[PDB]
Structure 1
Amino acid sequence: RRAVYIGALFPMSGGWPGGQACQPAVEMALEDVNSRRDILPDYELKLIHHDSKCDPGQATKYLYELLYNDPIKIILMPGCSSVSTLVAEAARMWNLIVLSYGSSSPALSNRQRFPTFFRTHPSATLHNPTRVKLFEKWGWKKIATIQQTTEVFTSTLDDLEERVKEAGIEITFRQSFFSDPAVPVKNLKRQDARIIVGLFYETEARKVFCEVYKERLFGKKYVWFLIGWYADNWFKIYDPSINCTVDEMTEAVEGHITTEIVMLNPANTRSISNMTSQEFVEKLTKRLKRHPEETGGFQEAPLAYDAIWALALALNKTSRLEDFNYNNQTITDQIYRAMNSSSFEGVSGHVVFDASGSRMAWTLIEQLQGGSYKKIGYYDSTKDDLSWSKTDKWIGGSPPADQTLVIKTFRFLSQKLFISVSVLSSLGIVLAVVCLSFNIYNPNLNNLTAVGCSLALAAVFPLGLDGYHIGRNQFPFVCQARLWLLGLGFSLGYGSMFTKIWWVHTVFTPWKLYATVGLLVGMDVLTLAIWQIVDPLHRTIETFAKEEPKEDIDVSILPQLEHCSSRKMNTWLGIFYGYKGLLLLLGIFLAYETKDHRAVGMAIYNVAVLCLITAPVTMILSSQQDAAFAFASLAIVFSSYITLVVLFVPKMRRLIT
């Protein structure tokens, strides 16, 4: 026959020991293809291989060892990523073609720098549409990222940024480190982010999880996104470089979401080898003496399998191939043209690779749920199908989010204190109307004072509460109406009270005086109209309290209140209070001056001190819960009650006394 030799490479250890599994796989594959005489009627396949541990110093030594020796090899098989880039960079000087099987660099899609390079493994960018859909499911916006400083991670982070920027989700905290996890996990604790995505290998995943247990940054509001092709025992192997114990790490890594992609047919079909995926997996578990949960590279071995089968059919398509030398190019271009149109059906489904790559359809997503991994669902990017199963447990059921806020409206005391206020106003109204009807049914200025105090006891009720009736947001209209009515009522009552003592002081030292005091009362409605013309009303909002008083929920409570105001109302109300205080002190001086008159003076002495003691306590107060409205209503209803029960004591008691 003819022994055709093929160089190979298997990283037995280091950051990714897949060659431990791929080497019996390719041995099985070489024995199965050494069967049909229809594909190779003349040749025989031979295998030359070594180890490199993803170390370029050994990789350069072994490349020299295979290149500058005997016999002549044709196709090479590089293991790691940086070494794969190095060999695909330098394969051109021998006119060779290189085939990788584990690299994920999207910059490796260039044909200018890499004309003679292919890779069966799909790139890393098919975690991003699934990532943005799982972010779109819950609407989270503040995500932090941390990476080891590598090109194969920065080209992913750049693809994720330029994919998430169209979705309107910002990436706030973007950190990086090389081998020191202490200062960046200090920065993450100091920046207290909620959802954290990480991109680093395993030995530092253990170190960063020791650091995040030590900083106490795991817990309730923390979601950890990692890749998921690690083994299931990874937080269990003894590493003496760190003093952390096994179960505080196990409790720390509990409840995090892991993503991956499929590698083979989920169904059962038949290849040209007349076997299926499941029987193939059974044969791998038969011959491999270790466990698949503890070995490396167990999921990716069928891509090596159909990679050999693809090159074998390509060599049958080429069908005098025994005089190859590195100087010429005709054999290389002929084999390259025959391999370019490679398109068929293998164990992993349709096997096409002379395109832009990424021909997989479905991906996969799991969550550690109590000491073991468990499936969430499936996905396809083109059909956008997100197959679910509803098994995601959470912290009590809900997914923790970034941060919210509650606007809380400052509550009144629409309770028995308000109902007592309303019943005292109603009692004043009823008592006033009963005494006025008794006076009419047996002092016309006294009748007008009774009407004014009845209007005060009718304007006592509509001071309102914190939004409790049919129909609201007309609070300025109803408060300005109540204020105008109370103003006119107090103006009328105090004017008809004061004009009697003015005329008794005049007589001490028919409708003239009464009509002029009625126009003196109606001056105040001109003041009310001038207050109504330029700035009648406003419903303002005060934010008197501090945000987040709540104890357990991360929704900041902002208490906001409201009081009726105007554009510039403070000097206006001060001027009106000064005018009414001027009239009230004039009355209180005239009552001592011209000393009906004794009772009228004592009533003036009570009502003046009441109004003067409660003008400031409703002017300078703002806590209306038990102080402002309580003091004002107590003042006004005690005033009207006591003034009526003194001014009509001597009438009806002495009519029948």
Structure 2
Amino acid sequence: ERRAVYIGALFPMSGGWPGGQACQPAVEMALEDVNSRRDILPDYELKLIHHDSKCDPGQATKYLYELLYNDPIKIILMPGCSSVSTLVAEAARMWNLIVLSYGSSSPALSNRQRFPTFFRTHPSATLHNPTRVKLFEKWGWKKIATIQQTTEVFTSTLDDLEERVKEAGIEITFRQSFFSDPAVPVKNLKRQDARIIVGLFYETEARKVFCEVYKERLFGKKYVWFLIGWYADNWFKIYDPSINCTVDEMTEAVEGHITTEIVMLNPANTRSISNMTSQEFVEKLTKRLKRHPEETGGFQEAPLAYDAIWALALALNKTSRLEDFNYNNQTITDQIYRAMNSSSFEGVSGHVVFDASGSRMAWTLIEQLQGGSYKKIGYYDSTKDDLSWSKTDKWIGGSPPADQTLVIKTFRFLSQK
């Protein structure tokens, strides 16, 4: 009785960021909740056709071919990580499709003249940069180093960090990059005497970077690392056959490094459009999962997928027209684009708004690894300039280290005897 409308999806179950493991049951939950309600789509039905993209553009290309050239006509695609998202979003203008990501954080995906029909619920990764500049200004650091991986997400984050950090009077003295092997840039960092290091790379690559860091002795009391807080909580103890450094050596190779992450979940206990608070959502998701939340990848991005499905459903209800969609005409797709561009509703992850800048969240969690575990050491709100410092960060010597130790004009005095 209800005419089924189809959406395509690509969930990364492995690879750089295995977010599919916890963002796919969230999409299942959201689809069930929006199909049970008779107010949203009284005559249609949202159905899902998904593939495991493994977060690499090759299998993503194969599965995009299988999606766009098979039985059900799709009205929207939902890619996962930033690579697949960029590929699909720059390839989807030929088929006149809308692309709505849930876990894509590449600052380069904010270019409207290049990705014209692209939406996302994930915040842009430029939000970590003001937090990093604030932590540099607080601790009085003026010259930092970088070791990134040459993926467009990290390149864009580093560019934005550059124009941010140049605005407050801080300079990036040394820039290193690598595609699949970090040994050479790590030893160049060691040979160049870098102190404050900002690493922009995935976890399965952070393990290799830090094996090479341990073999170079680029750690201890003189070096401070600024990583990304979206890795697993035991990413350094995980057995990995590609690295030679054992677990006990790597546990001390990375010790006292700062990480930043966004909250992604509404801290208040008010009820959203789905009539469900954040606690009930998290509890239902945990009951729906197969393993514990701490070891299920992508648990912190499930509300983003929930809100993405709900926003898609609300924008389709605003137009309520669908089976007349084919990959040739531009009327239905730009109608849905105009419907989504003006979306505004209270989701499980806050006020969901599809703005161009991609920054609808404000609070940034700041952590530090102390004794093999992460401990929160502050919060930051970039707009109102609020730093809810908790005074918990530890250091070897009570005070944070300093790069480029300064000269000291010591006087010589006549011997008093």
For Structure 1 versus Structure 2, the TM-score category normalised by the shorter chain is over 0.9
**Counterparts of 2:112 and 2:405 in 1: how far apart (Å)?**
49
2:340–2:354 CA contact under 8 A, matched in 1: no
1:314–1:338 CA contact under 8 A, matched in 2: yes
**Counterparts of 2:406 and 2:335 in 1: how far apart (Å)?**
68
Could you say what secondary structure the match of 1:324 adopts?
coil
Q: What are the superposed Cα offsets for residues 384-432 of structure 1, whole Å, 9 maximum, x if unpaired?
A: 000011111111311111244565555554746xxxxxxxxxxxxxxxx
**Counterparts of 1:147 and 1:355 in 2: how far apart (Å)?**
26
What is the TM-score normalised by the length of structure 2? 0.94
**Counterparts of 2:29 and 2:267 in 1: how far apart (Å)?**
22
Could you say what secondary structure the match of 2:94 adopts?
helix
Deviating above 6 A after TM superposition, structure 1's stretches of 4 or more consecutive aligned residues are: none
| 2:48 aligned partner | 47
Gaps of 5+ in 1: 417-657
| 2:265 aligned partner | 264
Greater relative contact order, per chain length (Cα 8 Å cut-off, separation 6+): 2
**Per the alignment, do residues 19 and 398 of structure 1 end up closer, same or farther by CA in structure 2, a change over 3 Å counting?**
same
**Counterparts of 1:276 and 1:150 in 2: how far apart (Å)?**
36
**Per the alignment, do residues 177 and 44 of structure 1 end up closer, same or farther by CA in structure 2, a change over 3 Å counting?**
closer
Gaps of 5+ in 2: none
1:357 deviation in Å? Answer: 2.0
Q: What are the superposed Cα offsets for residues 558-617 of structure 1, whole Å, 9 maximum, x if unpaired?
A: xxxxxxxxxxxxxxxxxxxxxxxxxxxxxxxxxxxxxxxxxxxxxxxxxxxxxxxxxxxx
Could you say what secondary structure the match of 2:10 adopts?
coil
**Per the alignment, do residues 258 and 70 of structure 1 end up closer, same or farther by CA in structure 2, a change over 3 Å counting?**
same
**Per the alignment, do residues 355 and 211 of structure 1 end up closer, same or farther by CA in structure 2, a change over 3 Å counting?**
closer
**Counterparts of 1:314 and 1:407 in 2: how far apart (Å)?**
64
2:129–2:161 CA contact under 8 A, matched in 1: yes
Superposed, which structure 2 residues align to 1:393-412 within 5 Å? 393-405=394-406, 407=408, 410-412=411-413
**Counterparts of 2:301 and 2:103 in 1: how far apart (Å)?**
8
2:5–2:322 CA contact under 8 A, matched in 1: no
**Per the alignment, do residues 332 and 191 of structure 1 end up closer, same or farther by CA in structure 2, a change over 3 Å counting?**
closer
Q: What are the superposed Cα offsets for residues 534-581 of structure 1, whole Å, 9 maximum, x if unpaired?
A: xxxxxxxxxxxxxxxxxxxxxxxxxxxxxxxxxxxxxxxxxxxxxxxx
More helix by share: 1
Superposed, which structure 2 residues align to 1:27-46 within 5 Å? 27-46=28-47
**Counterparts of 1:409 and 1:195 in 2: how far apart (Å)?**
27
1:56–1:83 CA contact under 8 A, matched in 2: yes
**Per the alignment, do residues 116 and 222 of structure 1 end up closer, same or farther by CA in structure 2, a change over 3 Å counting?**
same
2:110–2:356 CA contact under 8 A, matched in 1: no
1:263–1:348 CA contact under 8 A, matched in 2: yes
**Per the alignment, do residues 6 and 414 of structure 1 end up closer, same or farther by CA in structure 2, a change over 3 Å counting?**
closer
What is the TM-score normalised by the length of structure 1? 0.61
Q: What are the superposed Cα offsets for residues 450-497 of structure 1, whole Å, 9 maximum, x if unpaired?
A: xxxxxxxxxxxxxxxxxxxxxxxxxxxxxxxxxxxxxxxxxxxxxxxx
Q: What are the superposed Cα offsets for residues 42-73 of structure 1, whole Å, 9 maximum, x if unpaired?
A: 12222111111123332222222222221222
**Counterparts of 2:414 and 2:333 in 1: how far apart (Å)?**
91
Could you say what secondary structure the match of 2:378 adopts?
strand
Q: What are the superposed Cα offsets for residues 232-269 of structure 1, whole Å, 9 maximum, x if unpaired?
A: 11112211222221111112211111111110111211
* Larger gyration radius, structure 1 or structure 2: 1
Identity %: 100
1:178 deviation in Å? Answer: 2.2
**Per the alignment, do residues 409 and 97 of structure 1 end up closer, same or farther by CA in structure 2, a change over 3 Å counting?**
closer
Could you say what secondary structure the match of 2:282 adopts?
helix
**Per the alignment, do residues 68 and 374 of structure 1 end up closer, same or farther by CA in structure 2, a change over 3 Å counting?**
same
1:312 deviation in Å? Answer: 1.1
1:268–1:276 CA contact under 8 A, matched in 2: yes
**Counterparts of 2:332 and 2:413 in 1: how far apart (Å)?**
92
1:233–1:293 CA contact under 8 A, matched in 2: no
More strand by share: 2
1:221 deviation in Å? Answer: 0.6
Deviates most, 403-412 or 236-245: 403-412
**Per the alignment, do residues 381 and 412 of structure 1 end up closer, same or farther by CA in structure 2, a change over 3 Å counting?**
closer
**Counterparts of 1:412 and 1:157 in 2: how far apart (Å)?**
49
Give me the CA root mean square deviation: 1.8
